[PDB]
Amino acid sequence: TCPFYKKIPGTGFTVDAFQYGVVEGCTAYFLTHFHSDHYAGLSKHFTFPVYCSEITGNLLKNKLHVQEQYIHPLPLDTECIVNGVKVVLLDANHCPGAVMILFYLPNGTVILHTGDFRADPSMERSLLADQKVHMLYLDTTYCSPEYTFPSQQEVIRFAINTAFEAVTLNPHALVVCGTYSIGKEKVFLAIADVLGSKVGMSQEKYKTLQCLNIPEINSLITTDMCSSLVHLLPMMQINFKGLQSHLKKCGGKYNQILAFRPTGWTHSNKFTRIADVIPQTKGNISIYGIPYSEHSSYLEMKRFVQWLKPQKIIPTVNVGTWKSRSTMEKYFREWKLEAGY
Ligand SMILES: CN1CCN(c2nc3ccccc3s2)CC1
Ligand code: NI
């Protein structure tokens, strides 16, 4: 059964609620983004209206084979009426196609649902500017002060400089990058750009990327592995065994692998600066864990919420334990007392 924090009161709407069968009273199902925990339950047999971004709709049609008659893409930054209620989709700064949803309820209440997001000061100059928001359904993934990590720009500078140095020292080195979902494409695109290569990948991953409206994508990616010196592999293969096995398949073209595992936050962020990050190495294979996050840091989350000044916050992540709920509630109250709302 569908939990309370996925229902929008005063409407027939749910958000990211496809794994609960027919939700009683639901006339429109919104999907914030194409990540499996959020789309869980969708398929070609789904027969209710789904509202989403254009990019999310391309993935629904081509990857999940949802019938076109049920896919309702909406443009961003545009007031739309859905089943008698005004809504707006805003860019979430998460993965491609990810949105936040503003709902203007018939009674005058305004609700913002962030979906998954990485809060940024640029959101302060979206259509949110000077918009009173009564209720905030908040991506609380990293809602504790220990969760620190660098900017995406800093992480990409590290990855580009590391890959360029390694391949310039050894032109027979291969670069490999792990993936298990959409998101974090800048990691492999930026490395391939500095090396003068297309990114090589499976047919299935190529299909996924073809759905993402990335400018000049045909110039950047390929299924011809032999033509490419930056390869994408499943995240599960980014280990010494998996990479040794891959190197064997490359027909003596390469004698070294440099691999990247984009993660979220890890406990080494409590000790080691991005500049000082070192790999794990065995023989001619080295593996870097890089903290490329598509969720708000604690500090980014706190700034956004203190700017927005919501009357009530409903967490959508870390909801399952009393300890995590109590921790989040304590921070919301600190933030409110500090800023005066
Ligand atoms: C059994 N543990 C319960 C507490 N835990 C977390 N609490 C929060 C709160 C806010 C952000 C993240 C977390 S993780 C870890 C698991
Ligand atoms: Ni997500």
Side-chain angles (χ1 to χ4, degrees), residues 1-23 25-203 205-215 217-240 242-247 249-269 271-281 283-311 313-341:
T1 51
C2 184
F4 75 91
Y5 69 87
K6 294 182 178 278
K7 299 185 182 168
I8 308 298
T11 73
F13 305 154
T14 61
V15 179
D16 300 348
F18 301 92
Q19 59 168 303
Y20 310 107
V22 172
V23 182
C26 185
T27 61
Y29 293 75
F30 285 77
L31 179 58
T32 62
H33 68 290
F34 195 76
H35 278 164
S36 65
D37 279 356
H38 297 259
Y39 70 69
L42 269 168
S43 72
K44 80 172 65 169
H45 306 294
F46 197 80
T47 52
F48 294 97
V50 179
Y51 289 80
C52 59
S53 67
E54 179 178 335
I55 288 163
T56 299
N58 295 340
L59 293 155
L60 292 184
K61 177 187 173 182
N62 290 285
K63 297 292 294 196
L64 297 186
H65 302 297
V66 177
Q67 297 173 39
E68 187 146 75
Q69 71 177 136
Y70 307 107
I71 304 168
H72 293 257
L74 305 175
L76 303 191
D77 301 322
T78 303
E79 297 176 331
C80 297
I81 310 300
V82 175
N83 295 357
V85 179
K86 179 165 66 170
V87 305
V88 175
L89 301 189
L90 302 163
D91 199 283
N93 191 43
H94 183 54
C95 65
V99 301
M100 315 191 288
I101 314 160
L102 262 184
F103 301 94
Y104 293 81
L105 264 46
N107 73 357
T109 300
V110 176
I111 297 176
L112 177 65
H113 195 305
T114 68
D116 282 349
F117 86 141
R118 183 162 185 178
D120 191 76
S122 62
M123 295 173 176
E124 306 164 20
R125 297 168 281 279
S126 70
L127 308 198
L128 293 177
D130 200 54
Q131 174 61 71
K132 207 201 160 48
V133 171
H134 304 86
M135 307 186 73
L136 180 61
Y137 287 64
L138 181 63
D139 169 14
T140 44
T141 297
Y142 297 128
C143 190
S144 197
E146 68 267 36
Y147 299 117
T148 62
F149 36 75
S151 68
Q152 293 174 168
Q153 189 278 335
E154 289 175 279
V155 175
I156 292 300
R157 180 93 276 206
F158 175 83
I160 292 166
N161 289 357
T162 300
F164 183 82
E165 174 176 325
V167 177
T168 305
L169 293 171
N170 181 195
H172 298 274
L174 176 64
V175 180
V176 179
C177 296
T179 185
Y180 48 31
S181 64
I182 66 167
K184 314 192 183 185
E185 290 77 12
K186 190 67 175 181
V187 177
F188 55 83
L189 297 170
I191 292 165
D193 173 76
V194 79
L195 296 178
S197 184
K198 295 191 183 180
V199 182
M201 64 194 67
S202 70
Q203 290 186 265
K205 189 70 188 184
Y206 181 86
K207 180 175 182 187
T208 301
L209 298 186
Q210 289 294 160
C211 297
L212 304 188
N213 293 342
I214 292 164
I217 193 58
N218 294 338
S219 69
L220 310 175
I221 65 172
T222 188
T223 53
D224 183 6
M225 306 297 294
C226 291
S227 72
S228 161
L229 63 135
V230 180
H231 297 176
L232 303 192
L233 290 181
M235 202 72 80
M236 292 197 72
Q237 193 156 12
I238 312 300
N239 51 69
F240 297 122
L243 294 165
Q244 281 165 203
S245 178
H246 188 71
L247 190 52
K249 295 162 204 140
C250 291
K253 207 159 177 288
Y254 309 105
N255 61 13
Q256 183 183 348
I257 287 176
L258 165 62
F260 295 90
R261 291 188 339 94
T263 67
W265 176 91
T266 75
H267 182 59
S268 52
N269 283 283
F271 308 122
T272 310
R273 258 170 172 72
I274 184 63
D276 302 330
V277 165
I278 59 169
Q280 291 194 197
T281 301
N284 64 345
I285 308 183
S286 295
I287 307 175
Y288 285 88
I290 60 174
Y292 190 96
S293 180
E294 292 187 336
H295 296 275
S296 312
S297 69
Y298 173 83
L299 290 168
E300 292 160 353
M301 189 188 303
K302 178 177 181 284
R303 177 183 172 108
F304 176 81
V305 175
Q306 291 182 310
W307 172 81
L308 190 72
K309 302 177 167 60
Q311 289 181 356
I313 305 174
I314 299 175
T316 66
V317 186
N318 306 309
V319 302
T321 76
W322 298 112
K323 179 176 181 189
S324 61
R325 285 192 155 282
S326 177
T327 292
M328 292 185 296
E329 285 184 2
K330 282 177 23 263
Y331 289 121
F332 304 153
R333 183 63 63 180
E334 287 180 13
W335 298 352
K336 178 184 173 74
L337 289 171
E338 184 184 23
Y341 57 92

